Paper text:
Here, in an effort to better understand the druggable features of the interprotomer pocket, we have analyzed high-resolution structures of two medically important enteroviruses, coxsackieviruses B3 and B4, complexed with interprotomer-targeting compounds CP17 and CP48, respectively.
We reprocessed the raw data (EMPIAR-10199) using RELION 3.0 and the resolution improved to 2.8 Å. The Arg residues, which come from neighboring VP1 polypeptide chains, are situated in the deepest part of the pocket, and in the high-resolution structure, we observed that their guanidinium groups form salt bridges with the carboxylic end of CP17. The Gln residue from the C terminus of VP3 is positioned at the entrance of the drug site, where the oxygen in the side chain engages in a hydrogen bond interaction with the NH located in the elbow region of the inhibitor. In addition, there are other contributions inside the pocket such as a cysteine residue in VP1 (C73) and hydrophobic residues (VP1 F76 and VP3 F236) that interact with the benzene rings of the compound, contributing to the overall binding energy and specificity of CP17.
Numbering used by the authors:
A (entry chain C): 1 to 237
B (entry chain B): 10 to 261
C (entry chain A), E (entry chain A), H (entry chain A): 13 to 281
D (entry chain D), F (entry chain D), I (entry chain D): 2 to 11, 25 to 69
G (entry chain C), J (entry chain C): 1 to 60
């Protein structure tokens, strides 16, 4: 016949290969398709959807709904911190089990902007202002309000419209950052402070909560598939 | 202006003064089955305005400690009106829904609810080698309630109900990929979702498959000071959309 | 795919893109130029690794069974499901309904078993793997008439060659496979719950076609599933708990996340 | 009956189908259409950013 | 293929499609819209799996024989018929006359046999399978002159390679093979009944070409028939009884169906 | 001398014959013609449904 | 020669496969066809034929 | 490529091509015809062997590890770097920044280990090599759930076949790999120096998929890297000293050159 | 979709790409462009041989 | 299938060979290039650069 020669990689099973293989059932006609609502064609469709972030998660809070709630209250003075967590989804305790964060433990690399939304869930007599800050890395976390207003920030005023978005720009030396912890591809720190006290009248609760959401922007992308560390087994089920 | 809404289906009309828009499904509005997707060869029954109209279910109190509630959709309307009398005489049917959840409280109250319509919400059992009975999953217009503590494992046909796993073994804060709205008491007093028919078959029997489950879950507890109203109800109202039925037989 | 950043200068306007109402059930479409001054960036990034036909289209080991050329356990039986093994199962359960064609690939190995047999001298082993569609005869022994394979798909494989593979169509009676079923198959609503016949796709049998040696040899067959030509509908939250059973969604209650010291601390515990 | 298509780059390749079943073909890797607007913005009224979400 | 349902409204007419006479030997052409109100359905179903060249065109094991590299039974003899094995035979006997080309495929395996031979050390086995058309010399021993294969088709196969295969034309002297013959070959109408020479297609011989080992090895050859290019005429009721013999249609009387409790019961026994 | 034919779908493939005998060719899988009217309705007179079978 | 590479599924015998294989008898001409009544080309031809149903089937 | 010599006659001119200033940091562009009488030569020589995509594009052994089918060391772990082995490493360090695609090729061999096991009789060995991208589960034993390979690239190889190979893209987060890093990853400038995450490209695992024999077999896997599609920037002086460590540039001070007797001697010592 | 290119000689060959990734292609051997003027003569002022380097 | 024949040099690993081989990561898009000063495309570029010669090299 036709003289041929085999090359390295013949008679191997590579799990990522695409080759054609004969059907075991030939001339089998499959059932028609129907239009089912909500077809998914990309996983960045469903990473652009808001998901409640468990900011609190200190001891026994993860075994309750108190994880999702962020305390804020009427206190003396202002310029006290409300929360702080580091930017690094798919590593951080805060972000690893969010909807964004679990489409990001299947990938090694990530790029793009992330938008946090906050929703004030006090009474309609409560009012206040917050400073929602993001600091690039290289100087540690800000420990005062005056240190935190030197970074990117938004001042949020609560009225009608009970949410505000802090969009986190992409500021990185590299085009991608590792999903896993590395100090070369450090993300920075996201902190919140009282710009002004929570002020309430009599007969309205002086303790209120904030809920946080996280989603990707439209410039976001992920790269390089890998197994997730979050599912295990000891035997077949 | 943007906060006023009116929805008219059959006899019924709903009117709200505080509204967060209407969420529509996956961007698909209810429609009748096409003749290029149909399998069954009989002529459908389409009752129209005798099935497709709002039905109020029983109210349930929101307390400072309340974990949440669920209703499984075709089997929460199964005893109500002629909706309930067409699904026991027919083998098949398909319908979408408009779910409207109401909860009004003063401007000195606070709290937040998540209102989700979850396709095929299959729920675990407390005992790991059993599956739940149908008397632990299905109400009939009475709401089933979640728990805040794990259900102990006996020799149970009980559901494993915990708010934070949502009774399905998933994070409860990730239920926001399903069509949803929030009722935040300082903003709005109602939530409207319009579900289309979601299934992997064009019609299905409705007395052994529940293709949607409504869940109302507090994320921020109800709180108020002494002197305020201490009883705040949550009412659920559900209207069929484009109901069809096929396969007429005897009742049962 | 990825969109280009657009430059923006100072603002002072009645526009309020940052303020929103998240009660509406709508994810805000705010981009970075809204809240701050940005430069114009050209992006050449792509979203080609996060396609559903990249995510699910890699071979994954679903099961393995053993069988011997002597004594009991002469053949292996397995009902095809992608739910015995955690990793593949979790990926498919990002969706409620999926539709795909399989490609089965079999890695069959053999291991000499300890014995006091003198003068063992194996011949090459040939293995038969037989796919039996739902219903029809089931072999009850090695050397039954069911291994004739007159109308059941079957492959034969001699050792030291490439793994066998075969493609399977989409075999559902429905218009998609369902990964979740919130119902009973009985009209009484009694019996097993979450059991449905949309996901049937037969049983697999495997045996030795010869005992080559006078001594005992035990083989292990590993089955790999690779979805292809995938379509998926209705996304779901990922599984948070460990799986317990292959037919149930049953779980042990698990905390939302791992803990940390304070709500201001920048490290995990 | 060969198809010629572009490769993934930061050229072209040739493919012939050899079998009579369309379930024997290699996986479709290069389909990049997407539409996140079903899951984000499922609201009936059109939301305009730079205008109040609630009047 | 499958036809589309057509919508129908109420009737009250002198038409009577439901009433018929079944004495005429004609199957009624009534469709569902005749007897009831129907909707219009588009059908996209096909009848492509029920073609005769799908039904009969899968490999099926017809026979297997054994032979050894020592002692008696040095070779295997088999007269080619698809009537030794039940499953293939039943499928072909949905028809009276069939015409097809074969494809033979051979799965040859070897197994070490127990002995007290010290220091066995097999070389690779090579096997010869020889097809002998009707008439002509028949080997009477391993190492006869008939295995020269000067004009008899033959294949040689070394172990650990792909199964051999060869195509055979349609070899009948008639215009179709017959699966049934209601006659005698003798003009006296004596002798064997149902025996005919339309289905002759030689004999198959198989041996080892070397004894590789000093110890005894026994091989098993399995023959697979795959019809292709099929044409079939005159359909027949399926076989209801178990087969007894390969040359006869002889049977043990069997009941029509399995029983049940009553003529109103909805379960089987 | 290649044939290009359509695949079974819910594309196209290429086939070349390599042998000089037409009994060496692959099986004919895609022949879907049929005529049930030999075995159903073998009657000499034409039966019309919506009319008596016997007058 | 031409550089080639083998893939999984080489040297297997799949019973449902369609491949070409050389004839053992080359240049053999087959007997002509005749028209025989009642050719069957599909099995749904012969499933559309009435068949007496054994409704009773209770004991003997 | 190579340029042609041009003929020249006598000169006596105010031109001074031979005189130059080498302080300017400019290499003189003097050709032989400037300083002497030359003939015209046609050159047909080429510079095609000294392309960067010839110099670096040959397979080079980077590492080898061993693992056994019994006892301890059931699998082999290796973090992919081209810096364990001297020869490949030196060639890449003619440049500061390089960008290329790998082709991995594995030469896997097995050797019987001495034992007092009677009646050993190995079956063919099958090996699994599993590439794990940075992060994600790491196998901690042979027979963990990580060897499922649901989303990790993996190959399986049976003995006596061609070496496996696979191509790897350019996997850097940077726009080129760096062979030198004059910094710390920490902002404090503490910890390890010269450590960077631009050159991460996972870990490789290798095991036996079966123990074929009753006796002990030890395998050795050798990994070969072949750069291809290369681009390189900023050339550097070659390494003069022997390497000490794979993560450091540390060296023992070495003389400039080897010695000789005098500055007028025409031989080496 | 075949490319035909010249061989290294003191004829032509044919190549087809078989894979959908451009990192699967054979090495580029025949790229012979070069520019030594970055590393030799990096000076701002143009040096002319047959004229003083320094006036 | 298509009758083929293998030649000497099949199933060998020649270290200088150029053949195509499937990617282990398909559809992976690589990071963009940037212009970095001083690209090298030939080694005769960097052999045409002056280098100080150690003419003396006698003992210490
Ligand atoms: O290697 C993999 O592909 C592979 C290894 C482990 C695996 N999943 S596991 O949950 O870790 C697991 C771990 C062990 C066994 N298991 C055994 O090791 C074993 C030995 C003998 C009989 C039965 C079994 C058996 O069920 C089954 C599953 C999947 C695949
Ligand atoms: C269109 O298909 C014709 C283009 C040229 C085809 C070359 C075919 C390559 C070799 C045959 C592959 C056949 C697979 C059954
Ligand atoms: C028509 O047959 C010519 C079309 C191009 C043929 C490509 C042939 C593929 C390789 C040869 C197959 C030869 C089989 C004997
Ligand atoms: C352009 O590519 C068409 C030119 C003729 C192609 C002959 C193809 C040779 C055989 C197929 C190689 C296919 C690799 C996937």
């Amino acid at each position: 016949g036709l003289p041929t020669m085999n090359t390295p990689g013949s008679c191997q099973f590579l799990t990522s290969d695409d080759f054609q293989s004969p059907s075991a059932m030939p001339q089998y006609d499959v059932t028609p398709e129907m239009r089912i609502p909500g077809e998914v064609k990309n996983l960045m469709e469903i990473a652009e959807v808001d998901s409640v972030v468990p900011v609190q998660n200190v001891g026994e809070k993860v075994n309750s709904m108190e994880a999702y709630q962020i305390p804020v209250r009427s206190n003396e003075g202002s310029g006290t911190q409300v929360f702080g967590f580091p930017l690094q989804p798919g590593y951080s305790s805060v972000f690893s089990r969010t909807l964004l964060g679990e489409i990001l433990n299947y990938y090694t690399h990530w790029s793009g902007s992330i938008k946090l939304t906050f929703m004030f869930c006090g009474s309609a007599m409560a009012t206040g202002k917050f400073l929602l800050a993001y600091s690039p890395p290289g100087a540690g976390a800000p420990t005062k309000r005056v240190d935190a207003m030197l970074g990117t920030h938004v001042i949020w005023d609560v009225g009608l419209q009970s949410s505000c978005v802090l969009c986190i720009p992409w500021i990185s030396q590299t085009h991608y950052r590792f999903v896993a912890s590395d100090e070369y591809t450090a993300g920075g720190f996201i902190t919140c402070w009282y710009q002004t006290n929570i002020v309430v009248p009599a007969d309205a609760q002086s303790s209120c909560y904030i809920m946080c959401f996280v989603s990707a922007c439209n410039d976001f992308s992920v790269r390089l598939l890998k197994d997730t560390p979050f599912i295990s087994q000891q035997n077949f089920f | 202006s943007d906060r006023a809404r009116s929805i008219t289906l059959g006899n019924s009309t709903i009117t709200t003064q505080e509204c967060a828009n209407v969420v529509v499904g996956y961007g698909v509005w209810p429609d009748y089955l096409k003749d290029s997707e149909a399998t069954a060869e009989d002529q459908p029954t389409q009752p129209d305005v005798a099935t497709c109209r709002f039905y109020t279910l029983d109210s349930v109190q929101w307390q400072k400690t309340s974990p949440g509630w669920w209703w499984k959709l075709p089997d929460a309307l199964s005893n109500l009106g002629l909706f309930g009398q067409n699904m026991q005489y027919h083998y098949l049917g398909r319908t979408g829904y408009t779910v409207h959840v109401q909860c009004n409280a003063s401007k000195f109250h606070q709290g937040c609810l998540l209102v989700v319509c979850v396709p095929e919400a299959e729920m675990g059992c407390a005992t790991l080698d059993n599956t739940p009975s149908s008397a632990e999953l299905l109400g009939g217009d009475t709401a089933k309630e979640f728990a805040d503590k794990p259900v102990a494992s006996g020799s149970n046909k009980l559901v494993q109900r915990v708010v934070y796993n949502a009774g399905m073994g998933v994070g409860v804060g990730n239920l926001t990929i399903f069509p949803h709205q929030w009722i935040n008491l300082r903003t709005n007093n109602s939530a409207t979702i319009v579900m289309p028919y979601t299934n992997s078959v064009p019609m299905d029997n409705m007395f052994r498959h529940n293709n949607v489950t409504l869940m109302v879950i507090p994320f921020v507890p109800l709180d108020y000071c002494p002197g305020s109203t201490t009883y705040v109800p949550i009412t659920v109202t559900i209207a069929p959309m484009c109901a069809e039925y096929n396969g007429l037989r005897l009742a049962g | 795919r990825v969109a280009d950043t657009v430059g923006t200068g100072p603002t002072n306007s009645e526009a309020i893109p940052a303020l929103t109402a998240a009660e509406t059930g709508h994810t805000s479409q705010v981009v970075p130029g809204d809240t701050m001054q940005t430069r114009h960036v050209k992006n050449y990034h792509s979203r080609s690794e996060s396609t559903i036909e990249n995510f699910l289209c890699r071979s994954a080991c679903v099961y393995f069974t053993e069988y011997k050329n002597s004594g009991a356990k002469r053949y292996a039986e397995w009902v095809l499901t992608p739910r015995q093994a955690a990793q593949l199962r979790r990926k498919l359960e990002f969706f409620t309904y999926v539709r795909f064609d399989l490609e089965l690939t079999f890695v069959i190995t053999s291991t000499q078993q300890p014995s006091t047999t003198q003068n063992q001298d194996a011949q090459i082993l040939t293995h038969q793997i037989m796919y039996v569609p739902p219903g029809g005869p089931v072999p009850d022994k090695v050397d039954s008439y069911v291994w004739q394979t007159s109308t059941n798909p079957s492959v034969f494989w001699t050792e030291g060659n490439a793994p066998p593979r075969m493609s399977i169509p989409f075999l559902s009676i429905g218009n998609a496979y369902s990964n979740f079923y919130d119902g009973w198959s009985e009209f009484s609503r009694n019996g097993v719950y979450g059991i449905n016949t949309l996901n049937n796709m037969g049983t697999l049998y495997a045996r030795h076609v010869n005992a080559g040696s006078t001594g005992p040899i035990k083989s292990t067959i590993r089955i790999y599933f690779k979805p292809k030509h995938v379509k998926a509908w209705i996304p779901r939250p990922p599984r948070l708990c460990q799986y317990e059973k292959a037919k149930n969604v049953n779980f042990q209650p698990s905390g939302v996340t791992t803990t940390r010291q304070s709500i201001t601390t920048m490290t995990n515990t | 009956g060969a198809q010629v298509s572009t490769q993934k780059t930061g050229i072209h390749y040739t493919n012939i189908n050899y079998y009579k079943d369309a379930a024997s073909n290699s996986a479709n890797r290069q389909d990049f259409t997407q539409d996140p607007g079903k899951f984000t913005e499922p609201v009936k009224d059109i939301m305009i950013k730079s205008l109040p979400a609630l009047n």
